[PDB]
Design a protein around this nucleic acid. Structure first.
Ligand code: MG
Ligand code: MG
Ligand code: MG
Ligand code: MG
Ligand code: MG
Ligand code: MG
Ligand code: MG
Ligand code: MG
Ligand code: MG
Ligand code: MG
Ligand code: MG
Ligand code: MG
Ligand code: MG
Ligand code: MG
Ligand code: MG
Ligand code: MG
Ligand code: MG
Ligand code: MG
Ligand code: MG
Ligand code: MG
Ligand code: MG
Ligand code: MG
Ligand code: MG
Ligand code: MG
Ligand code: MG
Ligand code: MG
Ligand code: MG
Ligand code: MG
Ligand code: MG
Ligand code: MG
Ligand code: MG
Ligand code: MG
Ligand code: MG
Ligand code: MG
Ligand code: MG
Ligand code: MG
Ligand code: MG
Ligand code: MG
Ligand code: MG
Ligand code: MG
Ligand code: MG
Ligand code: MG
Ligand code: MG
Ligand code: MG
Ligand code: MG
Ligand code: MG
Ligand code: MG
Ligand code: MG
Ligand code: MG
Ligand code: MG
Ligand code: MG
Ligand code: MG
Ligand code: MG
Ligand code: MG
Ligand code: MG
Ligand code: MG
Ligand code: MG
Ligand code: MG
Ligand code: MG
Ligand code: MG
Ligand code: MG
Ligand code: MG
Ligand code: MG
Ligand code: MG
Ligand code: MG
Ligand code: MG
Ligand code: MG
Ligand code: MG
Ligand code: MG
Ligand code: MG
Ligand code: MG
Ligand code: MG
Ligand code: MG
Ligand code: MG
Ligand code: MG
Ligand code: MG
Ligand code: MG
Ligand code: MG
Ligand code: MG
Ligand code: MG
Ligand code: MG
Ligand code: MG
Ligand code: MG
Ligand code: MG
Ligand code: MG
Ligand code: MG
Ligand code: MG
Ligand code: MG
Ligand code: MG
Ligand code: MG
Ligand code: MG
Ligand code: MG
Ligand code: MG
Ligand code: MG
Ligand code: MG
Ligand code: MG
Ligand code: MG
Ligand code: MG
Ligand code: MG
Ligand code: MG
Ligand code: MG
Ligand code: MG
Ligand code: MG
Ligand code: MG
Ligand code: MG
Ligand code: MG
Ligand code: MG
Ligand code: MG
Ligand code: MG
Ligand code: MG
Ligand code: MG
Ligand code: MG
Ligand code: MG
Ligand code: MG
Ligand code: MG
Ligand code: MG
Ligand code: MG
Ligand code: MG
Ligand code: MG
Ligand code: MG
Ligand code: MG
Ligand code: MG
Ligand code: MG
Ligand code: MG
Ligand code: MG
Ligand code: MG
Ligand code: MG
Ligand code: MG
Ligand code: MG
Ligand code: MG
Ligand code: MG
Ligand code: MG
Ligand code: MG
Ligand code: MG
Ligand code: MG
Ligand code: MG
Ligand code: MG
Ligand code: MG
Ligand code: MG
Ligand code: MG
Ligand code: MG
Ligand code: MG
Ligand code: MG
Ligand code: MG
Ligand code: MG
Ligand code: MG
Ligand code: MG
Ligand code: MG
Ligand code: MG
Ligand code: MG
Ligand code: MG
Ligand code: MG
Ligand code: MG
Ligand code: MG
Ligand code: MG
Ligand code: MG
Ligand code: MG
Ligand code: MG
Ligand code: MG
Ligand code: MG
Ligand code: MG
Ligand code: MG
Ligand code: MG
Ligand code: MG
Ligand code: MG
Ligand code: MG
Ligand code: MG
Ligand code: MG
Ligand code: MG
Ligand code: MG
Ligand code: MG
Ligand code: MG
Ligand code: MG
Ligand code: MG
Ligand code: MG
Ligand code: MG
Ligand code: MG
Ligand code: MG
Ligand code: MG
Ligand code: MG
Ligand code: MG
Ligand code: MG
Ligand code: MG
Ligand code: MG
Ligand code: MG
Ligand code: MG
Ligand code: MG
Ligand code: MG
Ligand code: MG
Ligand code: MG
Ligand code: MG
Ligand code: MG
Ligand code: MG
Ligand code: MG
Ligand code: MG
Ligand code: MG
Ligand code: MG
Ligand code: MG
Ligand code: MG
Ligand code: MG
Ligand code: MG
Ligand code: MG
Ligand code: MG
Ligand code: MG
Ligand code: MG
Ligand code: MG
Ligand code: MG
Ligand code: MG
Ligand code: MG
Ligand code: MG
Ligand code: MG
Ligand code: MG
Ligand code: MG
Ligand code: MG
Ligand code: MG
Ligand code: MG
Ligand code: MG
Ligand code: MG
Ligand code: MG
Ligand code: MG
Ligand code: MG
Ligand code: MG
Ligand code: MG
Ligand code: MG
Ligand code: MG
Ligand code: MG
Ligand code: MG
Ligand code: MG
Ligand code: MG
Ligand code: MG
Ligand code: MG
Ligand code: MG
Ligand code: MG
Ligand code: MG
Ligand code: MG
Ligand code: MG
Ligand code: MG
Ligand code: MG
Ligand code: MG
Ligand code: MG
Ligand code: MG
Ligand code: MG
Ligand code: MG
Ligand code: MG
Ligand code: MG
Ligand code: MG
Ligand code: MG
Ligand code: MG
Ligand code: MG
Ligand code: MG
Ligand code: MG
Ligand code: MG
Ligand code: MG
Ligand code: MG
Ligand code: MG
Ligand code: MG
Ligand code: MG
Ligand code: MG
Ligand code: MG
Ligand code: MG
Ligand code: MG
Ligand code: MG
Ligand code: MG
Ligand code: MG
Ligand code: MG
Lengths: 275, 48
RNA sequence: GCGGGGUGGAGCAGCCUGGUAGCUCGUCGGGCUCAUAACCCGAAGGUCGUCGGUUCAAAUCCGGCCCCCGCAACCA
RNA sequence: CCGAGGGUAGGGCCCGUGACUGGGGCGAAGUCGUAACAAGGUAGCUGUACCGGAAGGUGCGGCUGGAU
RNA sequence: UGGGAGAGGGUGGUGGAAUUCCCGGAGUAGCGGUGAAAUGCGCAGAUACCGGGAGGAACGCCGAUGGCGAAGGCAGCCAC
RNA sequence: CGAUGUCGGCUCGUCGCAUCCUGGGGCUGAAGAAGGUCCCAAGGGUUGGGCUGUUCGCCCAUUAAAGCGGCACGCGAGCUG
RNA sequence: GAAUGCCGGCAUGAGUAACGAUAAAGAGGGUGAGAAUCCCUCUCGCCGUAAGCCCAAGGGUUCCUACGCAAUGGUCGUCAGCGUAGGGUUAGGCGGGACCUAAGGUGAAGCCGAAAGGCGUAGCCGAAGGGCAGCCGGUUAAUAUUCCGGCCCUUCCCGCAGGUGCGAUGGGGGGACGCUCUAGGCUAGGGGGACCGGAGCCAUGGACGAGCCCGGCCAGAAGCGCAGGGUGGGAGGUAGGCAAAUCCGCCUCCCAACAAGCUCUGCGUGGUGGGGAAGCCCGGGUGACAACCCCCCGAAGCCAGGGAGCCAAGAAAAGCCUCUAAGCACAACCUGCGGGAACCCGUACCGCAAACCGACACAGGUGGGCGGGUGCAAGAGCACUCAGGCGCGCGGGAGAACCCUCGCCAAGGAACUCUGCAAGUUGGCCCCGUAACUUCGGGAGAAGGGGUGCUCCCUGGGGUGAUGAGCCCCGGGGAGCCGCAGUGAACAGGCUCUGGCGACUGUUUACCAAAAACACAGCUCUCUGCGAACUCGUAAGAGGAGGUAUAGGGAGCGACGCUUGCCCGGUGCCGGAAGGUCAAGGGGAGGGGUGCAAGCCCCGAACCGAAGCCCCGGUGAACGGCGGCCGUAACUAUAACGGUCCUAAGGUAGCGAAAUUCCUUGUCGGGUAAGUUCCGACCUGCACGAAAAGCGUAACGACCGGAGCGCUGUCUCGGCGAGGG
RNA sequence: GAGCUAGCCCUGGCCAGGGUGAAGCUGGGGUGAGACCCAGUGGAGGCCCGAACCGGUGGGGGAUGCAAACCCCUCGGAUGA
RNA sequence: UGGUUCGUGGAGCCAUGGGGGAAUCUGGGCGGACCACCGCCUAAGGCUAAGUACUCCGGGUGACCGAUAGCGCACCAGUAC
């Protein structure tokens, strides 16, 4: 339930911030936080390879457990739900009966002080992880390994989820958050339920400064530039694109499909995305 | 206003210094030439 | 300056490829209707902007003149 | 001290008027169509939405004050 | 206090018929549509038939001149 | 073209006369007053404002009159821009 | 003899401009061959959130002293940051190293690249970050937390005693963190004292005083006192912290919980060691047995790792504590005490500048701390002033024009000009009061007005203390006094009405443009299923992202409001297993060369044969495009209506002489005495129009228009005065 | 060659004083309970005024300069992109 | 595809990044597409003086310079700046 401000500044008119209601702990588990190296968009050559990045708030990276088969059968208690600035979702702190502590990302409806567990025989109850084949067909699910033992890859962003449609052999058919129908291997783990913090998309950053807080530096349009800088650069006064709208590097940017043609995973995608 | 020369003994030494020269091929050939020409000082004097 | 046009009453084909001008509307006479329109059957009307030339023969090809749009008239 | 009123500044209400603009009423014999009264030739009316030279048309839902 | 009837309302659950679309099969020269047609769709294999899948929406018979609500209004089934 | 800096304004003027006013005249379809037209005449004078970058032009209020040109469309080693 | 030739010399301009902030000078005395310029004294002025003091960077003997004046110094020079010579920088505690890690750099392993080289986990290097033991005073011409004095402390080595399962580059804890706001108690610093110490002073009309002037402290171990921070104790189980673990984590059990206790800082006190003024006398000596106390103000600094709220969610490693492991318990470590040991480098001086960066002793540039007092509402603002430091390295005269900076002005008041350009006006505080419109915040300091000093009297509340006095802080009422004037000096908005453009705060052409331009939240399209797309790279490898479609790349549009129409024929993109074309390769009908021949060698048709192109569709917040002629109504005029040619389709809502209208100063209305601009309308829109968005929009703007009030030397129209030339 | 300048990374530091007064919280009120209203408390913000600091709007001076971008008056930002 | 005079040319020869892939003398390469004949030569392992190139160094000699010449430097020069 996003929070509103009164229009006591120009920017507070539309600025909205998250409610943080589901959060119970306001400083991270010291045993699970390591420093996050800000890059500013530059690679090991020193070159900007992703434009308009930098200048954002300092952050500590929280180690997240995307391979919950690491601890089969060991029930954990949900001890907290915390902010993670490296994510759109929230994270939940788990106290295993083992004594070990880990971070998973928080599904919607997960309550502190409840049990979760992972394994082939786990109950079909929000927050539990099972290999995809044992989850009943029709279930919503998140944090899905794209390949067995390689790590939870799909549906990790706030509010997202994947639904299980059916099976054929060693594979189950998933409706991804995009609408794509894909075969994913049944031995791939997945956590039941959709990711929490669904109102994340309903936030209005409100002013330019908020973008700078998130590390996002001002984007400058090709039309604003000169021909030495962009296909859209130049012109006396304003100017329409005057050619197929291109990127800074020459390729067309309004429809040109860029997925590799002979990519071996094509055998497993069933229906390309919707909308 | 603010001019271009803003001296700094660490910057001077780590940029034009002797050990900076020997590390790269062009730096070595710089020292090679200044030797050949007979320069009294092959690298800037900066007293740390 | 460059380009395209002028032909029955109105709006357009024919000109490029010389001989023969055609389409819709309108106009005239007749039908149907109690009557009008619509509709149906028939018919008339154009020397092709003008003068000159080529030709056996010019709406048609070449030249001038009249006119109509369209484009340009930049560095100053 | 108060004090008629004069002066400066800012409000409120009404009245007349105003290039132009909106529809309205009325006007013996204008132009276009034919929406309604017969099932009026697509039953009509209706609240709303969108559209159209115009009456209107159409979608959604409702009413019979609809025929057979 | 003891009982009854009911599409009264809200939440969640779920069941079948139908249409569209998708895939496999089999199959051929038309399908569709109207007052009559054309547009459209079909040898790039449609229409018609069978099997599988996805999804949304509305609840056939019961059903009635019926029942419920203050009105607007309320119809598969189950539970709160 | 191994550089002769543009329009307009401001400042400072100076000359020409094809004269706007003032002085002297002839003719008048000149009664007077006031005009028309032409001749002589360059001594002096020839206003303030609204609009526009404007020169010009239109307008307001006056005026004896609100003249027209030349001086590198006078004048940026004088100003403005 | 010429090349705006080259190098050098010397002219011309010319005794000309200038001699570098307008903070400012004058006299006496001295030194000396020589003095506006050096030394001393008295008087005058300037800075004083500095133009004073202290660090850092950079500079590198410029520091102190003697002797010098050729050049350097914009003049002079006896002087100097100049010449010559001598002297001067002292550390276990300050800073750096023998400690740690950050970005980054490097790089056993490993990967990659013609060569050169590029990557890369560990590890190593890397600091103004972490960690770590010295405070006060004296002394030199010149160094001082470094020498000396006083009082403290750290580490290493060996020894003694007491205690313990001792032991680590391995495990764990800790270190360890943001932004704003902030409590309590202190310290720095400051104000006052009718108290304490002091050489003195009585003037020029008065005062021998509760007179004037000066000063009234700094450091300190243990112990104690005040204020804080940090911190539960025990037991059982244990599968996790990549071996172990008695530690940590997880579970249950029993006690203590705003406490207390234990520990750790700050402040006060503290044995003791130092300091100690004005004035006088020659940096010294005296004052002086100096005194060293009371009250108030009081931090942004301290207690500190304090508290609270918020979102944008806020380093690492070591020291340190704990756990164990090999090994070892003749050890080893922990504690207390003693003796010994404790290396290298910096240390002068300048340091908002005459010593650094600007060719200069250059009106420019340069990070951190301290930065006193009074009054003005506050303050680091402003005026004066303390400590301290200066008068800016050419002067003297004169009293023109003209230039600069400044003061004033009769009557008028924008008549100036492209334009109120510039300069006036307004100006802080307290109180009264405040419109359209609005997104209900705003517009707003709207507008406009009153008050403001000093004296006497009465009184309300707060802090400290005690609840009282005292000092200090917010106030209210009554009566008066004076001047032209009471924020009496200085610092301190002119206002309003209405358009255009851009929502807004922001950004930009360093050195002619700060804008209407860029950015911006927000909207849409499109790409991307992750070894993502995209980007940098030959590659390895990186960014993307330790992210996963509520995400990431690209593009246009640009808050918000109401909206965004028709065209897919062309171009782009997307879809389409048919057809057409199509390269190498397959195929080899059929020819050729050569040989006696077996054979070797060459050419070569049909046919099969990818993408691309053709072809069939889709697609506009994709590139883009959105007609002409003629006729028609019972006055005229004009056409709701009609005819016909064309097109892929013929511009919709809204707006319109516009940042767009050529003809144009269109026409009409408003405002003006007068209006090529302005504002409101009309619509024959040369040549608006809907995300190169269309039409509006409160708020905002050193943006560009128009008008008005206020006020003025802008002007009629100039005059006088000041200072630097 | 990034000791100027531009962006980013890591690590530190700086921003006098005054003004306005969001949410929340407390109490009151209101209702079936609510929404909501009022007062107090609170101290939010690419909020407002104005030094330091960062700028460079208009004008004047300077133009073989004090200066190869300076000086004076004035003006913008100043808890934030 | 490179080398050769050889730029696709009748394009051999020498070399070789890709593909296919033998033989040991009765074997193999060459004589400018190719074939016959006639000849030359023995690939896929290595080494090898001398004659040749150069002048930092030393000496000798000039119809070479003679301080603006001759080396940038006759001299404390790759210095000062
Ligand atoms: Mg909001
Ligand atoms: Mg939340
Ligand atoms: Mg990263
Ligand atoms: Mg790197
Ligand atoms: Mg590199
Ligand atoms: Mg990029
Ligand atoms: Mg970037
Ligand atoms: Mg994310
Ligand atoms: Mg989160
Ligand atoms: Mg799989
Ligand atoms: Mg958003
Ligand atoms: Mg961020
Ligand atoms: Mg963005
Ligand atoms: Mg942009
Ligand atoms: Mg551009
Ligand atoms: Mg541009
Ligand atoms: Mg470039
Ligand atoms: Mg290019
Ligand atoms: Mg280009
Ligand atoms: Mg372009
Ligand atoms: Mg452009
Ligand atoms: Mg442009
Ligand atoms: Mg244009
Ligand atoms: Mg466009
Ligand atoms: Mg174009
Ligand atoms: Mg393009
Ligand atoms: Mg897909
Ligand atoms: Mg600079
Ligand atoms: Mg620097
Ligand atoms: Mg340095
Ligand atoms: Mg340094
Ligand atoms: Mg450096
Ligand atoms: Mg070096
Ligand atoms: Mg280097
Ligand atoms: Mg080498
Ligand atoms: Mg030497
Ligand atoms: Mg060098
Ligand atoms: Mg015709
Ligand atoms: Mg035709
Ligand atoms: Mg033709
Ligand atoms: Mg005919
Ligand atoms: Mg009859
Ligand atoms: Mg008829
Ligand atoms: Mg003829
Ligand atoms: Mg003829
Ligand atoms: Mg013909
Ligand atoms: Mg009166
Ligand atoms: Mg009808
Ligand atoms: Mg009808
Ligand atoms: Mg009909
Ligand atoms: Mg009808
Ligand atoms: Mg319709
Ligand atoms: Mg067919
Ligand atoms: Mg077929
Ligand atoms: Mg569906
Ligand atoms: Mg010329
Ligand atoms: Mg010349
Ligand atoms: Mg010249
Ligand atoms: Mg000249
Ligand atoms: Mg006369
Ligand atoms: Mg007369
Ligand atoms: Mg008369
Ligand atoms: Mg005259
Ligand atoms: Mg004019
Ligand atoms: Mg002219
Ligand atoms: Mg004109
Ligand atoms: Mg007269
Ligand atoms: Mg002339
Ligand atoms: Mg001229
Ligand atoms: Mg001329
Ligand atoms: Mg001319
Ligand atoms: Mg001229
Ligand atoms: Mg000039
Ligand atoms: Mg001029
Ligand atoms: Mg001129
Ligand atoms: Mg001149
Ligand atoms: Mg001249
Ligand atoms: Mg100009
Ligand atoms: Mg100008
Ligand atoms: Mg000659
Ligand atoms: Mg020359
Ligand atoms: Mg020369
Ligand atoms: Mg010379
Ligand atoms: Mg000489
Ligand atoms: Mg000379
Ligand atoms: Mg001479
Ligand atoms: Mg001379
Ligand atoms: Mg001379
Ligand atoms: Mg002269
Ligand atoms: Mg000079
Ligand atoms: Mg000067
Ligand atoms: Mg000054
Ligand atoms: Mg001055
Ligand atoms: Mg004197
Ligand atoms: Mg003197
Ligand atoms: Mg002297
Ligand atoms: Mg002298
Ligand atoms: Mg002096
Ligand atoms: Mg002296
Ligand atoms: Mg004296
Ligand atoms: Mg002061
Ligand atoms: Mg120096
Ligand atoms: Mg001298
Ligand atoms: Mg001398
Ligand atoms: Mg001498
Ligand atoms: Mg000198
Ligand atoms: Mg001298
Ligand atoms: Mg000098
Ligand atoms: Mg001298
Ligand atoms: Mg002397
Ligand atoms: Mg010394
Ligand atoms: Mg010591
Ligand atoms: Mg050692
Ligand atoms: Mg290290
Ligand atoms: Mg090399
Ligand atoms: Mg290497
Ligand atoms: Mg290093
Ligand atoms: Mg180091
Ligand atoms: Mg350090
Ligand atoms: Mg830190
Ligand atoms: Mg230390
Ligand atoms: Mg101490
Ligand atoms: Mg000391
Ligand atoms: Mg340890
Ligand atoms: Mg911590
Ligand atoms: Mg915050
Ligand atoms: Mg103290
Ligand atoms: Mg005080
Ligand atoms: Mg005494
Ligand atoms: Mg265990
Ligand atoms: Mg377990
Ligand atoms: Mg501490
Ligand atoms: Mg004594
Ligand atoms: Mg501070
Ligand atoms: Mg602290
Ligand atoms: Mg690290
Ligand atoms: Mg053992
Ligand atoms: Mg033993
Ligand atoms: Mg022990
Ligand atoms: Mg050593
Ligand atoms: Mg020292
Ligand atoms: Mg100093
Ligand atoms: Mg300064
Ligand atoms: Mg400083
Ligand atoms: Mg100095
Ligand atoms: Mg110097
Ligand atoms: Mg300079
Ligand atoms: Mg000086
Ligand atoms: Mg200076
Ligand atoms: Mg004081
Ligand atoms: Mg005083
Ligand atoms: Mg006072
Ligand atoms: Mg004040
Ligand atoms: Mg002076
Ligand atoms: Mg000064
Ligand atoms: Mg001076
Ligand atoms: Mg004189
Ligand atoms: Mg005055
Ligand atoms: Mg006066
Ligand atoms: Mg006056
Ligand atoms: Mg006035
Ligand atoms: Mg006035
Ligand atoms: Mg005016
Ligand atoms: Mg004038
Ligand atoms: Mg202007
Ligand atoms: Mg003032
Ligand atoms: Mg009003
Ligand atoms: Mg109001
Ligand atoms: Mg408004
Ligand atoms: Mg309001
Ligand atoms: Mg006021
Ligand atoms: Mg007020
Ligand atoms: Mg009063
Ligand atoms: Mg007084
Ligand atoms: Mg102000
Ligand atoms: Mg703006
Ligand atoms: Mg807007
Ligand atoms: Mg915007
Ligand atoms: Mg904006
Ligand atoms: Mg700002
Ligand atoms: Mg510029
Ligand atoms: Mg420029
Ligand atoms: Mg700048
Ligand atoms: Mg420049
Ligand atoms: Mg400028
Ligand atoms: Mg600006
Ligand atoms: Mg500028
Ligand atoms: Mg820009
Ligand atoms: Mg933009
Ligand atoms: Mg939007
Ligand atoms: Mg969207
Ligand atoms: Mg690339
Ligand atoms: Mg990563
Ligand atoms: Mg734009
Ligand atoms: Mg609105
Ligand atoms: Mg559109
Ligand atoms: Mg349309
Ligand atoms: Mg199209
Ligand atoms: Mg198409
Ligand atoms: Mg198309
Ligand atoms: Mg087109
Ligand atoms: Mg067509
Ligand atoms: Mg519409
Ligand atoms: Mg118009
Ligand atoms: Mg107009
Ligand atoms: Mg407009
Ligand atoms: Mg236009
Ligand atoms: Mg024109
Ligand atoms: Mg016009
Ligand atoms: Mg015009
Ligand atoms: Mg006009
Ligand atoms: Mg008027
Ligand atoms: Mg208008
Ligand atoms: Mg018109
Ligand atoms: Mg148009
Ligand atoms: Mg607006
Ligand atoms: Mg507005
Ligand atoms: Mg603005
Ligand atoms: Mg701004
Ligand atoms: Mg602006
Ligand atoms: Mg005005
Ligand atoms: Mg004047
Ligand atoms: Mg004077
Ligand atoms: Mg930099
Ligand atoms: Mg730097
Ligand atoms: Mg910081
Ligand atoms: Mg600040
Ligand atoms: Mg105030
Ligand atoms: Mg309050
Ligand atoms: Mg505040
Ligand atoms: Mg602000
Ligand atoms: Mg304010
Ligand atoms: Mg300036
Ligand atoms: Mg000004
Ligand atoms: Mg200049
Ligand atoms: Mg300045
Ligand atoms: Mg100023
Ligand atoms: Mg200001
Ligand atoms: Mg401000
Ligand atoms: Mg501030
Ligand atoms: Mg060759
Ligand atoms: Mg060849
Ligand atoms: Mg090969
Ligand atoms: Mg043989
Ligand atoms: Mg053989
Ligand atoms: Mg061979
Ligand atoms: Mg041979
Ligand atoms: Mg041969
Ligand atoms: Mg041979
Ligand atoms: Mg052999
Ligand atoms: Mg051989
Ligand atoms: Mg060989
Ligand atoms: Mg031999
Ligand atoms: Mg040899
Ligand atoms: Mg020799
Ligand atoms: Mg000779
Ligand atoms: Mg010589
Ligand atoms: Mg020589
Ligand atoms: Mg010679
Ligand atoms: Mg030599
Ligand atoms: Mg030599
Ligand atoms: Mg030489
Ligand atoms: Mg020489
Ligand atoms: Mg030398
Ligand atoms: Mg040198």
């Amino acid at each position: 339930a996003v929070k509103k401000f009164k229009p006591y500044t120009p920017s507070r008119r539309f600025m909205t911030v998250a409610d943080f209601s589901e959060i119970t702990k306001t400083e991270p588990e010291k045993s699970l936080v390591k420093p996050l190296k800000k890059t500013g968009g530059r690679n090991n050559q020193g070159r900007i390879t992703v434009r308009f990045r930098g200048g954002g708030h300092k952050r500590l990276y929280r180690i997240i457990d995307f391979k919950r088969w690491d601890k089969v059968g060991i029930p954990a208690k949900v001890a907290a739900i915390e902010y993670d600035p490296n994510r759109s979702a929230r994270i939940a702190l788990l106290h295993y009966v083992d004594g070990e502590k880990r971070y998973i990302i928080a599904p919607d409806g997960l309550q502190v002080g409840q049990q979760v567990v992972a394994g082939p025989d786990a109950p079909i109850q929000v927050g539990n992880a099972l290999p995809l084949r044992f989850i009943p067909v029709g279930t919503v699910v998140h944090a899905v390994e794209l390949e067995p033992k390689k790590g939870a890859k799909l549906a990790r962003a706030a509010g997202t989820s994947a639904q299980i449609q059916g099976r054929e052999g060693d594979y189950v058919i998933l409706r991804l958050p995009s609408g794509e129908l894909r075969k994913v291997h049944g031995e791939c783990y997945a956590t039941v339920g959709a990711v929490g913090n669904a109102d994340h998309k309903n936030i209005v950053l409100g002013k330019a400064g908020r973008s700078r807080w998130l590390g996002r530096r001002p984007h400058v349009r090709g039309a604003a530039m000169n021909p030495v800088d962009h296909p859209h650069g130049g012109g006396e006064g304003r100017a329409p694109r005057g050619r197929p709208p291109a990127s800074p590097w020459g390729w067309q940017t309004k429809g040109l499909k860029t997925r590799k043609r002979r990519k071996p995973s094509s055998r497993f995608i069933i229906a390309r995305r919707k909308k | 206003m603010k001019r271009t020369w803003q001296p700094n003994r660490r910057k001077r030494a780590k940029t034009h210094g002797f050990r900076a020269r020997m590390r790269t091929p062009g730096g070595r050939k710089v020292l090679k030439r200044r030797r050949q020409k007979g320069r009294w000082r092959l690298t800037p004097a900066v007293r740390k």
